[PDB]
Design a protein around this ligand. Sequence first.
Ligand SMILES: Nc1ncnc2c1ncn2[C@@H]1O[C@H](COP(=O)(O)OP(=O)(O)O)[C@@H](O)[C@H]1O
Lengths: 477, 475, 470, 464, 56
Amino acid sequence: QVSDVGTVIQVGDGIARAHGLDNVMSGELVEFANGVMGMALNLEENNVGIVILGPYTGIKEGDEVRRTGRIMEVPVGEALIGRVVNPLGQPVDGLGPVETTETRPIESPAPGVMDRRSVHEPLQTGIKAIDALVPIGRGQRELIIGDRQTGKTSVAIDTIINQKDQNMISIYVAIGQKESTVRTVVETLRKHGALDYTIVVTASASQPAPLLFLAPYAGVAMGEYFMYKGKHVLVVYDDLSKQAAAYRELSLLLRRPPGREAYPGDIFYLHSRLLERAAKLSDAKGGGSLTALPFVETQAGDISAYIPTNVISITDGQIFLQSDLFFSGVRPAINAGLSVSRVGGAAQIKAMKKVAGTLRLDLAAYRELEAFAQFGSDLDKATQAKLARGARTVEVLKQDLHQPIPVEKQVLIIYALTRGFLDDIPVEDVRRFEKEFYLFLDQNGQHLLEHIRTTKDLPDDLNKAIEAFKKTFVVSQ
Amino acid sequence: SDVGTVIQVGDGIARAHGLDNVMSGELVEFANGVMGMALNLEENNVGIVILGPYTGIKEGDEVRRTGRIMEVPVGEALIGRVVNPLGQPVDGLGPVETTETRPIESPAPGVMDRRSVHEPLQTGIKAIDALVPIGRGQRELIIGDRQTGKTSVAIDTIINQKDQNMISIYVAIGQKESTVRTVVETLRKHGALDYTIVVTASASQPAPLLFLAPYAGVAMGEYFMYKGKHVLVVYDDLSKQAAAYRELSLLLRRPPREAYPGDIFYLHSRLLERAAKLSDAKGGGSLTALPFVETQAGDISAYIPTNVISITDGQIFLQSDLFFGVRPAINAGLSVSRVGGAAQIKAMKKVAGTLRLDLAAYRELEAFAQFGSDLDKATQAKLARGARTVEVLKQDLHQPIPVEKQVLIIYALTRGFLDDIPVEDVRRFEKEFYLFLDQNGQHLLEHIRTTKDLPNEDDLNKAIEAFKKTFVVSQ
Amino acid sequence: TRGRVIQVMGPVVDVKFENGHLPAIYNALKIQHKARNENEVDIDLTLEVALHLDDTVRTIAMASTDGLIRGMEVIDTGAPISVPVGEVTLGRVFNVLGEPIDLEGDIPADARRDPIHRPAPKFEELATEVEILETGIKVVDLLAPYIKGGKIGLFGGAGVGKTVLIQELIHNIAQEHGGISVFAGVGERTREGNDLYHEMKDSGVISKTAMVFGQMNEPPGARMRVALTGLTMAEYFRDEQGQDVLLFIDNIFRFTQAGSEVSALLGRMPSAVGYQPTLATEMGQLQERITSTAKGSITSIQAIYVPADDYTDPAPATTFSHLDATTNLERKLAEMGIYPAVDPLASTSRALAPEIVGEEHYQVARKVQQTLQRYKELQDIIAILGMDELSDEDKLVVHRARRIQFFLSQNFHVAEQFTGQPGSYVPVKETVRGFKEILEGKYDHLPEDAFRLVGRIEEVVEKAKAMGVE
Amino acid sequence: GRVIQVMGPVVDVKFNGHLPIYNALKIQHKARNENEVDIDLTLEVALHLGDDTVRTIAMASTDGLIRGMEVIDTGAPISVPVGEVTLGRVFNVLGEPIDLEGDIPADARRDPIHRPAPKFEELATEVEILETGIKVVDLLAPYIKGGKIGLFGGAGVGKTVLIQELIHNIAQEHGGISVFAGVGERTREGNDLYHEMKDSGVISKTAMVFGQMNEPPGARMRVALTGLTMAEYFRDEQQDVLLFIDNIFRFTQAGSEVSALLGRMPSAVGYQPTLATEMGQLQERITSTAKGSITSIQAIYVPADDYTDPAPATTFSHLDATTNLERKLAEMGIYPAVDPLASTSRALAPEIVGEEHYQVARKVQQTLQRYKELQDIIAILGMDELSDEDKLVVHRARRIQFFLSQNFHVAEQFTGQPGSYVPVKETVRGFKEILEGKYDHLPEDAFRLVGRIEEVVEKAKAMG
Amino acid sequence: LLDAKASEHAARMTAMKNATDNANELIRTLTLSYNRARQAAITQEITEIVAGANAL
Ligand SMILES: Nc1ncnc2c1ncn2[C@@H]1O[C@H](COP(=O)(O)OP(=O)(O)O)[C@@H](O)[C@H]1O
């Protein structure tokens, strides 16, 4: 009792060194007499560094600091689904409180080596570019790295919006992001109906660093619930670059010895011990999954930056979004070159597995080739042929926004161009082709795309081959 | 509450106990007789910046208050007198008899105390008064590599201030004392000390002096300014000041980008700010600042250089990359003037305007000129005078050119009057057409002066008077 | 509630309140000391609590600290810096402390002056659907639409008409939208500032806007707070009067710069490039305060000086993360007589998507750019092959391209002073229609100089028969 | 005193009221037992640490010292024997004869190695060029009598040899009082030079002051002051003086060695926060006055070939003439490897060197630069796509950049070539013809390593 | 001509390889000097960030 509370020596910059608390656990919640919560990080001999989670102005010296005896845990339950809450779980969406029975501690160990099963079950992103070239299975970790205003968010969004028929209970963690955006985003979800499966955890750029720091882990916690049940979760940590930064601030304030680029020595441990918490649970455990989508905002696109590098090596591959592509009006701004998915292919379904194999090729050469057109005034060789469907695939890889594409009628278009059933059509008409080639199927191939569903295979090859002509032979120009 | 006791003495800096009454930045006095400034007022001691030799000081020595904020002698006695930052004359012409005394750190004119600079400061160097024009009360940073013509430019400018009412103040921070001599000497040769002061803190002097040099000069300048006269202050090498102040700050163990103090920006900010144009409600006074910065390798992205740039209104960058072609190495590309054009008179404004365009293309068509004629069409045309104009912007050392005739040559080429002549005969053409202006015709050689504006002869006159000398020139 | 100065480190002061009182963080502490002898100096100096270090507080002096003597008592105002708000601030120029620096008198003791430190709106208070802000400026509303309640970047400052734009903006909004503007100089060039004042006096728009000057000559504290001060004045007309205001912050870079400077005297550990470890967070609590709540909205135009044209520096980086669009002013377009001098390619906007403007704006917009890109690249050839050969299409482009990048100028309300042309407010709708048609080539017969400095597409017509066309 | 703290070369000697700055403390102690060693050391008061304590900088190995020993204040800075006795002798950092010939008289004047720099009234202005016989220098960067010459160069660039060739070309024929202080430089050089001084016939008129690589920091700290005070004698007490300081870098370098232990806040690169000023207080002292003239030539080492390094960088603003040596030019075989576009002199004026010499001067530099710019193309596309005009510039330039090579008498023993002193009128002329194209026929290699232009024609025919 | 041109294109086909190849080596020579300057830089930045902390 006498020990289990303490008195504030120093206040400022979201940090409080208190006396007493001789019994606080490193990582124990500590409440201030003013009601504002906090966390004990530095347990030293004569004092304890705390990181104030909330307004630190209403805190002066001498204010009492009383322990809790709990390690930073957070609400968890089937009632958050559809609710917007902060890293503390405190609803900010302004509709009632979140009524949940259970709870889970933020800090948690990851499923053990044995505990998991090699990812096989995919995640359909609904984005041709992604789930063809850079495929993502449930339990995987795909870091989408890119410079601000490349669409990084857009992807995550349309991805989530693509989770309705799939069984995926989605969680969007917003760190450092403008509360402005996070709102307009949580809404466009409202409209597409993502809230029925989607949890939103926010800490904006107005909120104190410690909240940013806590938001990611607070997110996985809520995910972990559905995972250890056997359900499937998808966590989008939007911008770890900021969270990782928020930690730097907080850690520097506790005057922790700073490392390379000022980041603390455990900055790597930070993310590592976080991302691992997403995986595929072995059938022995109910075969659940939690897939993680780490964002990394890049300056100038320097992949060689300290933080962006760590997370690159941490994830299973990444998706690198070109800064220029985005402006030139190519959406998504994917860079097929650097973008790679390591777990790839066990994630894809046979029906994609085939028509995807060649997709990388055609696009490969085109990347190494089409640096030359203006000098190609002499256009030569068959190198003209590689470009041919090449410039055409790009068209097929260009997708709309807020308009996901089901695998069924996706494998077909990724089929068309890769078989030549597209090639006779100029690029001008490629986009506005695949558009009705869908409807043409939704009416007349609605039988064909079925076999594609129920078998995830196309052994199909014969029918479609002719069945594709049924369309070009009626299309406009 | 008045007296104090030294507890550390080293490197021109000392920390002493006592002095419970000192004001932040108060001038104190040691036992041996030298002064010092108190910067830190720490709970348990005081950071004193010893303003002179720190040999004659020991631990325990009494450091007695003054109750005076730093300040320096300012008067019409300083004209042509080489004095140190403290006012003490080093030129040996005897003491400086001054009446009034101005504080070093002084508030710059408010946002309501200023006026838009309209008064050009003629540098006399064509390339500058045509391209990057400077106005009265402006700040034109001239930054460049070791020995690019920095020192020589400012000097020529000062030397061109005979006609105009300008009181030059040249400071040499960290500069070589011997060098500052040949500078102050070469100034008397041309009779510039008749309006011009000199603040020398030589590299041998203690850092805090170099540091205090610049503020010491402006003070002297702000004198005539607030009074209604126009001043010109040359800060020669602010880099060394910062290099100094860093020392000063690092000695006082001030938490250190690139070891320079967080406040290293504020250092130059609160300085160059004190140069402006006081509103006509205040006597239309002005102080122009010509700060210097020594770039290593020409790296303009360096800490100090970005700082001094983010401050001055425009800057003139001097490559040596060149004075080993176009001489007074003036990189027409990077060099800017914010104020510019509001500085130049109606005589310059109309001609100097297209001077930019002509020079522009040439800097920009020049990834083209190879093709040459192959077929380049109308663009070897824009090239022609382009390659001519550079010759015009070429000027010889220590040869200031008056505005009047200056806007005439910057006229001739900008209308074709120079094209019938080869690029390699332009320099001669200046010498030539100008003498014959000084004799042949004479009427337009000071109209441009009197009105200082506009046609300079309606059109036909100039235009045809340009036909005069062209038609009389040589091959 | 009275303490005494213990430490003076440059702009940083350490006050000590003996017991129990302890001015809360962010509270403003006055020091009014009258010289008690010939060995001292008058002091009127206000401070802002930073941190409680032993019943001790540290502070950042908004003005100079010279003349301070250890022990002078400090007086807690009980509240942070608070500045006047309302119609009272309109046409009035204050300083960091909300003290009028003009000659037009002084603020009454009746005036409500809110604090400069407050938290941004609650998640449930913001705008749901993103709504564009019509500026009536062709270039903008077409290629770089301002988000009403966002942060627009303004790059390039030197002889581009930057001021007309800022001024014209203050004009248009307050004209068609009925709202105020608040100009905040944050630590950049007294000289420019003094001029803008006079220009807004002449432009007669200063009647519609309140100014604040934190210039490059003030100490860290001032520069660091001015943005907040000018801010608070803006928030008033939104929260209280439901208006959509425009808060201009000239060089918001000085804000985060001045920040690090002090951070060192406070004692914070150096971060990436010396920058205060608090950087991102300081900038956030500043920016997040600028958005459109249920009632009103604040849209801001910031001018960003990048640290030596380097876009990877912490300062700029951090800012861009709040930017919703970028308006680039090029020193090229002005020369060619295209005012505004906004680069039609470089200026981007987030709200330039069909989702936020629909196709006809988008379709037109992205097109008007493309055609402009052609006329750009071809420039090289033009200077090689003359106007003789370009695939006899490239001509058609260079035709429309000119008419288009020419029709991207406009009659500015704040240009009537030296020109006489009344000026125009062309709406997005009217603007889209004009380029629509110019793109359909239905104008290809009107001489260039007809689309040059006009209004709606009709004003090009009358400008034309004025040439003599049927 | 009583030494209570020994840190490397930095010793903390504790002292009421005794408090000796810049003074020399000698520690004279005798081995009391077999667990000790005889200590003869001299500490230079550095700063006052307070509590009646002082931090000192040793002049030799501090090994053997112990806490509680006894320190004596000589009550004055490091005093060094100065006078007409210093001629033909080798002193220490302290002014001790290391030449094993006698010692110095007690009557002899002992000056302190710390003086204030001459005032503004003292130092001279006047200009006089000085011929070195070096084609590059004389043409592109001429030296000045009583003026300060820097030699900037990285490791193994030819600094030393260049100095030798100067002392050879100048010191021998001047009639002046020579003072040569090798600072932190080689130990071999000392013996190479000392015993060649005897051959030649000046070891009368030259003052030898040494400290080399084996001496601790404190030593090199002052060897540049000790030697300066020597020359300062003949200048202010009597004639013109040639001050040869070999690697003034080692001074600043040793500086950083101590700066850490002083408890100083490191500056850029980890150099002493006083680097600038410490050099300011030792430079201006090396200057000519109205009393006597001092023409000094200092070797400046370039750490890692970085001219942006605080040491040589900060040094630049201390010279009236510079010669910057490049490793590139060195591997080219161009010796001395002297940057023809970097090296400068305040002398290059028409108002100093004459017009004829001026215009050629720039003319060379002009065409050397024009070749410099062309180099990226050559390195990518060869010379094939260059104009018939730029090519010519490539030939001239090269042959001019080769003729800038020279035979240094202090070379021969290696290469085997004798050597040459090229008169200024003959350098000026030689390049003229080359720029004027009388030689556009002769191959490059002919112009490599020669004297007067005539020799090129000679070595030319020898080619075939 | 035909044999002349055949040469031309060829001689150019190659001269445009020599340049490419050479240019490619200019990378190696720079990649190296970039890494080195990549190193000394990340070393100076860090040394700066710590040396500014020990100062507190
Ligand atoms: N003028 C020259 N002629 C021929 N060889 C030279 C010349 N200058 C230097 N060298 C060669 O270059 C090397 C460097 O010599 P040195 O002068 O000791 O360089 P540094 O003193 O700058 O380290 C020597 O081994 C010498 O053989």
